[PDB]
Amino acid sequence: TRSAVVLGGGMAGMLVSSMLARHVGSVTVIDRDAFPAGPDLRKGVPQARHAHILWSGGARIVEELLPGTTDRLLGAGAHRIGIPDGQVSYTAYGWQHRFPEAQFMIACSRALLDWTVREETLREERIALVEKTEVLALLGDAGRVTGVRVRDQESGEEREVPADLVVDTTGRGSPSKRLLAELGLPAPEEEFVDSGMVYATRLFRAPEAAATNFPLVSVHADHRAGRPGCNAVLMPIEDGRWIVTVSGTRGGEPPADDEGFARFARDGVRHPLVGELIAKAQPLTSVERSRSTVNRRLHYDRLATWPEGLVVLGDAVAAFNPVYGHGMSAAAHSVLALRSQLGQRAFQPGLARAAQRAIAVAVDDAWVLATSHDIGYPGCRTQTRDPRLTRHAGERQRVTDLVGLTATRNQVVNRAAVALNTLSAGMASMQDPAVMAAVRRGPEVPAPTEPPLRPDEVARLVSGAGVT
Numbered sequence: 485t486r487s488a489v490v491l492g493g494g495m496a497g498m499l500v501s502s503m504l505a506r507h508v509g510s511v512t513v514i515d516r517d518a519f520p521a522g523p524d525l526r527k528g529v530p531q532a533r534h535a536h537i538l539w540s541g542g543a544r545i546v547e548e549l550l551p552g553t554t555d556r557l558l559g560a561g562a563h564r565i566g567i568p569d570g571q572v573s574y575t576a577y578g579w580q581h582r583f584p585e586a587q588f589m590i591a592c593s594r595a596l597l598d599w600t601v602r603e604e605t606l607r608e609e610r611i612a613l614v615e616k617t618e619v620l621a622l623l624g625d626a627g628r629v630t631g632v633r634v635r636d637q638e639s640g641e642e643r644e645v646p647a648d649l650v651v652d653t654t655g656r657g658s659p660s661k662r663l664l665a666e667l668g669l670p671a672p673e674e675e676f677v678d679s680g681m682v683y684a685t686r687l688f689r690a691p692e693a694a695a696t697n698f699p700l701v702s703v704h705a706d707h708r709a710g711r712p713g714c715n716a717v718l719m720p721i722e723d724g725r726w727i728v729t730v731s732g733t734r735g736g737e738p739p740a741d742d743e744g745f746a747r748f749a750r751d752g753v754r755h756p757l758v759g760e761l762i763a764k765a766q767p768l769t770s771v772e773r774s775r776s777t778v779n780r781r782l783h784y785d786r787l788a789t790w791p792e793g794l795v796v797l798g799d800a801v802a803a804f805n806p807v808y809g810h811g812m813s814a815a816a817h818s819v820l821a822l823r824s825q826l827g828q829r830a831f832q833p834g835l836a837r838a839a840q841r842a843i844a845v846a847v848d849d850a851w852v853l854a855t856s857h858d859i860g861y862p863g864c865r866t867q868t869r870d871p872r873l874t875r876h877a878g879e880r881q882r883v884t885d886l887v888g889l890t891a892t893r894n895q896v897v898n899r900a901a902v903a904l905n906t907l908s909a910g911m912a913s914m915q916d917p918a919v920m921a922a923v924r925r926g927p928e929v930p931a932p933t934e935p936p937l938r939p940d941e942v943a944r945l946v947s948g949a950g951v952t
């Protein structure tokens with residue numbers, strides 16, 4: 485009984501459809517793109533050309549929604565990288581000491597992650613992916629949405645797809661504002677924090693022996709310094725490759741050319757380690773760029789009127805600067821928020837509004853982590869009424885910087901700081917008395933004076949071939 489229509493078959497659309505099929509009789513996923521039969525790039529997910537970190541908070545939710553996914557990713561060559569034990573990270577506060585594992589991330593190409601999630605989701609035959617199809621309008625009215633009107637791209641024919649619940653997961657470029665304006669609803673409040681961040685990415689073929697058990701390497705901006713924020717990230721992916729993404733805010737954007745890429749990885753960021761490591765490897769692709777880095781949130785949950793049977797989730801409701809690595813985990817938390825409301829309220833007057841409010845809560849930690857750190861860069865453009873961003877800046881930063889600095893050299897503080905940043909714990913966890921006592925305990929290890937690489941990791945950067 486009941487039917488759902490999901491707009492967009494990306495990460496959020498697949499996750500939400502796997503969940504919905506356990507509550508409704510049929511799910512139809514509408515997408516304007518064409519989908520490959522294997523782990524390939526596609527036009528509707530251009531961001532798959534750039535490094536994607538799947539933090540443990542999102543990975544555990546993906547695993548709850550689609551059992552076997554984590555093992556299938558690792559089984560296809562994805563890397564499980566412990567945090568902080570498997571990371572070499574020059575934070576705004578200095579090198580992170582590589583304490584024993586507190587959290588983890590999954591490292592692979594976004595194309596492999598998407599294919600793995602999609603192929604497992606679509607094993608449920610009550611979910612159908614309808615590709616190469618445009619979304620024309622929401623059916624119904626401002627009181628209740630009853631499906632969507634679509635157009636087949638190849639035939640040009642239009643048809644109505646009925647639904648008891650419509651979930652818009654069409655991503656950062658979602659036409660939700662247009663779809664909702666055509667229903668007669670008022671425009672939602674738009675909040676943005678735009679640092680002007682530009683990404684530049686190349687793929688590399690690293691030394692054959694490093695192809696496994698190599699750390700995630702990251703060189704971070706100092707968000708407190710009054711200069712453009714620049715970063716460099718080297719992440720292992722499947723089949724012996726490294727994806728390297730460099731970035732910079734307004735005034736420090738990376739260049740677009742292959743020859744300027746390595747120079748930026750050495751000299752454009754605060755420490756040259758990523759540039760030094762790519763000199764061991766072999767480039768495989770020319771530079772790809774992205775400007776899809778604005779933190780943008782649409783406050784659909786605060787609209788004065790909201791239709792029954794309509795929910796918006798994923799990048800269509802809240803999209804983040806990708807340097808923080810939260811978007812896929814925020815989408816996963818949002819699918820769980822909808823699932824919780826479905827289990828409490830089933831499908832009665834109020835489900836959609838309750839879910840929309842719960843989704844706003846679910847994305848809020850990722851929103852704060854990104855915006856609080858982007859708002860200070862020179863030339864940042866903002867539109868917000870969030871008092872966490874507009875008021876009490878001195879106090880807010882005092883708490884943030886104290887935890888961040890102490891986390892580099894204190895295992896208990898790092899465990900708490902890692903749990904929040906991977907979206908494995910909520911923001912309130914940081915005010916637990918044990919966390920703030922450890923903060924006051926202070927450092928337990930010296931600050932590293934050099935990148936904390938292990939000898940056994942650096943040894944695998946060379947082959948030894950030219951030696952008898």
Ligand SMILES: Cc1cc2nc3c(=O)[nH]c(=O)nc-3n(C[C@H](O)[C@H](O)[C@H](O)COP(=O)(O)OP(=O)(O)OC[C@H]3O[C@@H](n4cnc5c(N)ncnc54)[C@H](O)[C@@H]3O)c2cc1C
Pocket residue numbers: 491492493494495496497514515516517527528529531534535536537538539617618619653654655656657658659683774776777797798799800806807808809810811812813815
């Ligand atoms: C450069 C970059 C790097 C990132 N790095 C990370 C990272 O390290 N970690 C992380 O967790 N997240 C990262 N993200 C964010 C992550 O890619 C997104 O949060 C995630 O893909 C959101 O999923 P979604 O389903 O909402 O949208 P998408 O995955 O973008 O999927 C949207 C789907 O809707 C379809 N669609 C779009 N418009 C329409 C339309 N008008 N009609 C019909 N169908 C439509 C598209 O074809 C697509 O299939 C990064 C993003 C970028 C841009």
Ligand SMILES: [Cl-]
Pocket residue numbers: 530531532773774775776
């Ligand atoms: Cl992109």
